[PDB]
Design a protein around this ligand. Structure first.
Ligand SMILES: [Mg+2]
Ligand SMILES: [Mg+2]
Ligand SMILES: [Mg+2]
Ligand SMILES: [Mg+2]
Lengths: 427, 427, 427, 427
């Protein structure tokens, strides 16, 4: 026996819940006692999940707004933080298309193994940690906080409340700062911009949001919980059992047993209000990037929860210039921030940056061989004045940090890496 | 019992060795019966490994030369093939830096789990397969062979001859076409352009190459085997046991017991000749991109093995414009090709494309939010004239393909995905 | 391009479906052309999946009946075969409790990652392939077929028809011979002997069986598809949309929106008949091990489908002697076989053997240290007259096979393993 | 930025090394400043590793001796603890044979992916945590510490000092309490009781032990570091550079370049003395279970390091009764303990209990079907008086724990598992 990791008392938890401003608008339908009962006799400390959640929350209140780009590899997250961003978005869509545990390429329908996003959260954290270790030994203060908070996609939870619970717990173990959960049927989950969506009853999503906060409380971390509604476009729901949903039920039924329901901003506003006591940020998927519709939603929701922060998906699934002109595109995010959209993100930023850059390099390489690659290397060199450091790739991935480990173990090692390298001699 | 997967008899195998031109210049120090002894009573078919190896060998003989770019994600390989490339290079350096099974970022020192590259080989093939499947239902003939052969990094084998064997078997199970192996001490392995390299005796690498060939025979696939030598820059060797290495041994020793050895192209040529009978292609790492030095190595080897094909690494570890003028850079691969370097590749192409593109997007996003992303999207729409297809990311990852699966199971499903998607209504 | 892996034409497929007795009683609501449309231009051969499926089919018709024990580790399966069993059962319950990819211990509620069972199938196959490779070099003919067919748990599909499709595809790539699918709501899935079960409509499960068949056809292997119904104990159903389910619907509903239904053998018999055209074997979970009830179910079903084979679960979830006496327990399987249950299995066999055996050893060890282990070693020595071979653990796991590979690569190697070993000198 | 995870100052660390008795006989050839330089700006807390290491250290000084059995699944560890054991042994040999990330069965030669043991360490902790959670809700005080410390096999480090460092880091992240490292060449690694062992220079093993301490220091946890020497039977060494090794080097070399060296207890005493300043425990592999030889090694080492604790492998690789008589077998561990062997373990206990228990079950099942299984089931009911609880497998894997989560989320859920279960109604 030991006292390392001993659980706090229910009294202690109740107290934090009652005094920490963090929980000011947070309703919990279970007790402090209930949380303790599930903690066993040892509570593991989740440093990155704690730090990340705390940082994210402060930024949400200290900045005009927090934006982010989707990252599907650790290096992507490193470049986003090097360029100055202060949060990382981990898209489940990108994980399905190019970074999931089945090894397959999938459309965004919850087809991949449920521990896939948690593994990428752990991966992004490992990469940021390596960047952080490297910055320290290089005396580089170019970046204030390498461990930027990660907001990750919990999709529709991959099942019922217990699958939701295990996903949240695994995201936390991996070091996530925030997670989002949507009101769709897991078995028919869709990207918000794909058709064929099936909502689940308002209450069921409340059970999901409740389960996610519960896993966060049992793991002793203040994870930011985000509720997403897919009701703007969904015309199906699994059941009419919930009276808050009935006003939209048409009565028509499908062969699968689903119910037709009237889609639009109205159902989104209703669900948003019902989810508000259980969500630190609320988000409604929309069919076009429209400041006016965004404002309607914002005023409507804040008219009942003035302090409710909102999230917005600046989706690559929109044909941006088909809808907006440069002036509006230019002010898009600043406008939204004014409305209360404090977390903004380009979900598929990484998928497109990766696919395009490689198509572009490879197309050139197919025509001119080395000339096309040299053009890129020169662009990298030119970007150094902007803060870019990866042209010197050995140090970027830690060659200098491992050299430090090697010489700490054996100062006389004759097998260190950077000394005598072409990096040291040509860059 | 059944007859499915019945092992060939030793005679059938001998016959192929004796009559297939593929084995024309291949020495096997073990016998056909030795192969059969290790096969048990059932031999799995490795369709992709077989097809990729067959296609790779053909292209090496049919094209002026075969070039490639390193890919670390499945989508990367899909873009390389979409852009017209006919082979994919899978760099172990890239896997160490952003795609390995430990989840950590590492310098190129064989620090990651030994099954990492095989997993990426499997991923790459899964992605090319999906592209293949999609092009079929889309009636897209723009690409003749989506399943481009993959040439992957076996580094220094992660141990002894048995570790080499297991890595080759795992690469094959995953569908690899070719694999390369270097003459370095596994426990001190380095990127060819890092310092602190340690060679192993000439005969030890012959054992490695024999092991890689044996695993391919026991698996019954004609995998391409590439032999790499790091003697150009390496100043240390593990032992002076081999008479062929003794000529360069200086007598001086390091505190770890390594032997100092004279590095240069002379040691490279000597090892290249020793490796030939056991190598489909031969590669020597160099400290600079030099057409001259390349010719020297080439003539020297062909002087004794006229038909021996060579491989060359157009490495991002070189500061290209610092050593060459645009005229030479532009003719580089063509020139090398005339010398006999039939397989050429830019090892770290993916690391740079991915890191620079995300840095460029993020920096612009950090300043001007959506304007920066819209610039990228317009670039993608512009690239469609060149054959780029990823702007429509839903179909790119298979939304239409899984829609076809869904409608084959139940043509009247009310939850298919492309109908009513923003991709349909906006692209 | 190459011709390796070219798909069969639609005509060829249609022919096999038309002439092979394997497809005798098999309904496909999709066409042969539909299958070809989903295969892209290359079809990977799945050697063990095909061989296993063919063998299992043959055995189901040539033996009195086929039995099996649940296997959760590769060695478990190897011992099962060594002892004479001719098939392996891969329980999802066991995967949940001690062998899934989350690393966590879980109750049987579909909480683990969807690719867990496929990984265990690949594991079992690799273990069997090693025992086969060893028996060969040892001249051991004690076993005719080391590659016993594996029957694996596909639970409730982990989602919708596309999740079922991917699970089946992954099971096949891993080398499975047959897979079973149940009519429960995946998000609320339960072990068949736990409470809180919820059925899905009859047509929805036909969609699941159709999807499982479609994936096998696309992969081009004769997988055995098994249908399981949970209607004997389930008192809940997601919807009353299907007319075949309505007769059992009571009208009462839960706050979740579920529908109460009347359970018993009646709904199981009706469901069994509906699934019959879509299942190579049918299985109904029961609350106790009752030969009467079993005959009751069998007669009903064969009354309409005479050639329909059934499968029976002799579950550890039953307190066997609390229900039956030794005479009945002794003939249990032989009787069931008469009734037409050609596949019988003890789902949690491995979990109990492993938990009990270790508690027993650890208990004695905590008391008597080495004496307790020696008691076990002597039992293993004793069991050698029965065929047991693991007392000699080094050769059991392949030390001798690998020594052969080492000597094939270098007959003079001074680092082989069995020579000089305590196994060779003390056993 | 946040305060969470801020690194300690070099001064604070130095102070700990200076005053904590834990570090009484520990030599660290690097500085505290060196440790801090490698920690970046945030240090993750490793609760289980910290707790387990502290607990194991206390136990080693509070109990007559600490013993254990090799566990290869989480359920085995659970049983070992339910049965009274206070430590768990994680064998690399068992991982190679039946629990490694490649999915393959291997002999003990460092063939599996290097992150395999860490994942098994994480699995065991997860399982023990599940039991701790269940015990708390069942109010079971039967076990005082479910989180028993785990001592894991680090083998030969899978490479150089950097591979050692990463393996140690990964073992800590997974929650290990102690790790052991042997003086063999990783590429030729062997189970201590197989032939073909190649030693590395005494100084190289000191480097390994130093790297293992550094990784624990950077991770901020007091991990128990164990040194193993294989010099009793090894007759080869990689180099003769170390003057401490030279008295045993014969001058004769093999064709691979290895040096022949005279084996025995003498060079083991020499190596142990050299390793003592860098090892919390020292272990020498022996060819037979000989209390006299044990005493000889023990006395020789303590003559110079009286407080040095020792470890002993009661290997299943020995034919116990062939060497010892019942009386000695009975007092074996008690005697060793008196000599100073405070950690004793049966490396392959899990392998044997698993392989034997299944073969037995399967053999009896192939003959008497249900009768055989029934025999096992009553034995389990019988073992309940001794403290066994797995007969009731649903609660054993957390069915009741997840029911608690379910009702915490929704008290009115109609889909909980234990109510209406055959376990509840028949056990
Ligand atoms: Mg998403
Ligand atoms: Mg490489
Ligand atoms: Mg099951
Ligand atoms: Mg070991």
């Amino acid at each position: 026996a030991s006292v390392v990791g001993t659980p706090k008392s229910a009294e202690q938890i109740q107290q934090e819940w009652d005094t920490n401003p963090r929980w000011k608008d947070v309703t919990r339908t279970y007790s402090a006692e209930d949380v303790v009962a599930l903690q066993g006799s040892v509570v593991e400390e989740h440093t990155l999940a704690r730090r990340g959640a705390e940082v994210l929350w402060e930024q949400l209140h200290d900045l005009e707004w927090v934006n982010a780009l989707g990252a599907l590899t650790g290096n992507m997250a490193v470049q986003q933080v090097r360029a100055g961003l202060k949060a990382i978005y981990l898209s489940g869509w990108q994980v399905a298309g190019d970074a999931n545990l089945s090894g397959h390429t999938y459309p965004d329908q919850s087809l991949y193994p449920a521990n896939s996003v948690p593994q990428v959260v752990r991966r992004i954290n490992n990469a940021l940690q390596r960047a952080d270790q490297i910055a320290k030994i290089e005396g580089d203060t170019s970046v204030e906080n390498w461990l930027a908070p990660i907001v990750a996609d919990g999709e529709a939870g991959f099942g019922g409340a217990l699958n939701v619970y295990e996903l949240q717990k695994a995201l936390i173990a991996a070091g996530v700062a925030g997670s989002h959960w949507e009101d769709q049927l897991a078995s028919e989950k869709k990207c918000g911009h794909l058709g064929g969506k099936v909502l689940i009853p308002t209450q069921q999503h409340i059970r999901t949001l409740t389960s996610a906060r519960l896993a966060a409380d049992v793991a002793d971390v203040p994870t930011v919980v985000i509720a997403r509604t897919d009701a703007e476009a969904a015309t199906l729901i699994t059941s009419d059992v919930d009276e808050r949903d009935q006003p939209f039920i048409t009565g028509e039924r499908t062969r699968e047993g689903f119910y037709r329901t009237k889609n639009g901003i109205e159902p989104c506003i209703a669900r948003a209000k019902a989810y508000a006591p259980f969500a630190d940020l609320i988000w409604m998927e929309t069919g076009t990037p429209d400041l006016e519709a965004a404002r309607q939603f914002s005023e409507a929701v804040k008219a009942e929860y003035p302090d409710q922060m909102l999230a917005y998906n600046c989706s690559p699934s929109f044909n941006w210039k088909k809808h907006l002109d440069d002036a509006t595109i230019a002010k898009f995010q600043k406008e939204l921030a004014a409305m209360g959209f404090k977390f903004q993100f380009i979900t598929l930023a990484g998928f497109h940056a990766l696919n395009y850059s490689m198509f572009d390099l490879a197309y050139g390489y197919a025509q001119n061989q080395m000339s096309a690659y040299v053009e890129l290397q020169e662009r990298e060199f030119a970007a150094e004045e902007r803060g870019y450091t990866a042209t010197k790739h050995q140090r970027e991935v830690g060659a200098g940090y491992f050299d430090r480990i090697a010489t700490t173990v054996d100062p006389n090692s004759s097998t260190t890496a950077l000394t005598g390298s072409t990096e040291e001699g040509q860059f």
